[PDB]
Amino acid sequence: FMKSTGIVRKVDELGRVVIPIELRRTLGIAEKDALEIYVDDEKIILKKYKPN
Amino acid sequence: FMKSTGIVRKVDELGRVVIPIELRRTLGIAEKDALEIYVDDEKIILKKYKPN
Predict the structure, then answer these.
(1) Measured between beta carbons, which residues in chain A are less than 8 angstroms from residue B46?
(2) Distance CA B20, CA A14 (A)
(3) A1: chain B residues, CB-CB within 8 Å
(4) CA B4 – CA A19 distance, rounded (Å)
(5) Residues A14 and B18 sit within 8 Å (Cβ to Cβ)
(6) Dihedrals phi, psi of A21, to nearest 5 degrees
(7) Distance in Å from the first CA to the final CA of chain A
(8) What positions does the domain SpoVT-AbrB occupy (chains A, B)?
(9) DSSP A27
């Protein structure tokens, strides 16, 4: 099976979610960087964005 | 089996991402609701939160 952090956050007015700082560092993501958003099985997959 | 939406958003100061309103409605998510966050393969999986 796959292990997940299992951490939940409250949805703000715009419907946005925050990545834990531990994942900000491990994912190599910083302010002004670009994120790409995926949709599968009613779940959202977010990953670093590679320009095309 | 399914293709992702392929939509990208800019990261704000806190490192947060926004779900498209089309997904807010399909996912049944609203302000003050709880989201659970997963981590796998360097990708983040967010889904509705159903506490035990």
Answers:
(1) 17, 43-44, 46
(2) 9
(3) none
(4) 20
(5) yes
(6) -55, -35
(7) 33
(8) 6-51
(9) T
Method by which the coordinates were obtained: NMR
Size (chain B), residues: 52
Cα separation, B29 vs B49, whole angstroms = 10
* Contact between residue B52 and residue B39 where contact means Cβ atoms under 8 Å apart: no
Across the strands, what pairs with A38?
Answer: A45
Is beta strand B7-10 parallel, antiparallel or unpaired with respect to A34-40?
Answer: antiparallel
Question: With contact defined as beta carbons under 8 Å apart, do B11 and A30 qualify?
Answer: yes
Over its C-alpha atoms, chain A yields an Rg (Å, rounded) of: 12
3-state secondary structure (DSSP) of residue B38: strand
Pick the CATH number of A1-52 from 2.60.40.10, 2.10.260.10, 3.30.470.30, 3.90.650.10: 2.10.260.10
